[PDB]
Ligand binder design. Structure first.
Ligand SMILES: [Cl-]
Ligand SMILES: [Cl-]
Lengths: 120, 120
């Protein structure tokens, strides 16, 4: 049921981050168990869930292509990209960003963040 | 004086666009005289100036790096990228986007759009 959202908070939300350097990334990847094997690129949104959820309604997001929503507002964000062996030690590099994000909502909740916009 | 902004409206604002295809681009590049030589990549923001100007205050934009402002809100937008000869016929390709934009304001006005975010 409503858990893919839970999985989504766990992979793509860190409410209040303490600085956003590479040493940051390496930490939170591990904590959030994205290290076996090493996830090649992952992004975390910051701030509150309030906003993130509202991408799922015309409140803070209009539709976007086929099965995907985009937000009206911009999010502080941090993208961790692995450097090097898909296996730990898995120690990525960090890119702080600020811009709107794209997700799929189901039963009105974010349940997929779309990483394509963060290679760019 | 306050004209670099004028130049900036002329290069990077089209209030209400009639569709955003490649044939669009090719038209508005020419109209707005960006064809001799052909500008390699140019982006136009849509909607009202109201918003765009407000990137220059803590109303709709916080600072961004060194001498550059980013917007809090997202803009409908259209990026024309030249294909092929820097000389006309200059007929580019179009990419419609929606996301926040980065500019430099002077005397509180946008006077530079930053194109780097649109290669990506
Ligand atoms: Cl950014
Ligand atoms: Cl986009």
């Amino acid at each position: 049921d409503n858990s893919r959202y839970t999985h989504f908070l766990t992979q793509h939300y860190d409410a209040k981050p303490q600085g956003r350097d590479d040493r940051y990334c390496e930490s939170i990847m591990r904590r959030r168990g994205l290290t076996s094997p090493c996830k090649d690129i992952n992004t975390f949104i910051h701030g509150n869930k309030r906003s993130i959820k509202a991408i799922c309604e015309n409140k803070n997001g209009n539709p976007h292509r086929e099965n995907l929503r985009i937000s009206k507002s911009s999010f502080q964000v941090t993208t961790c990209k692995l450097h090097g062996s898909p296996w730990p030690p898995c120690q990525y590099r960090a890119t702080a960003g600020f811009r709107n994000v794209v997700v799929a909502c189901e039963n009105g909740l974010p349940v997929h963040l779309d990483q394509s916009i963060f290679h760019r």
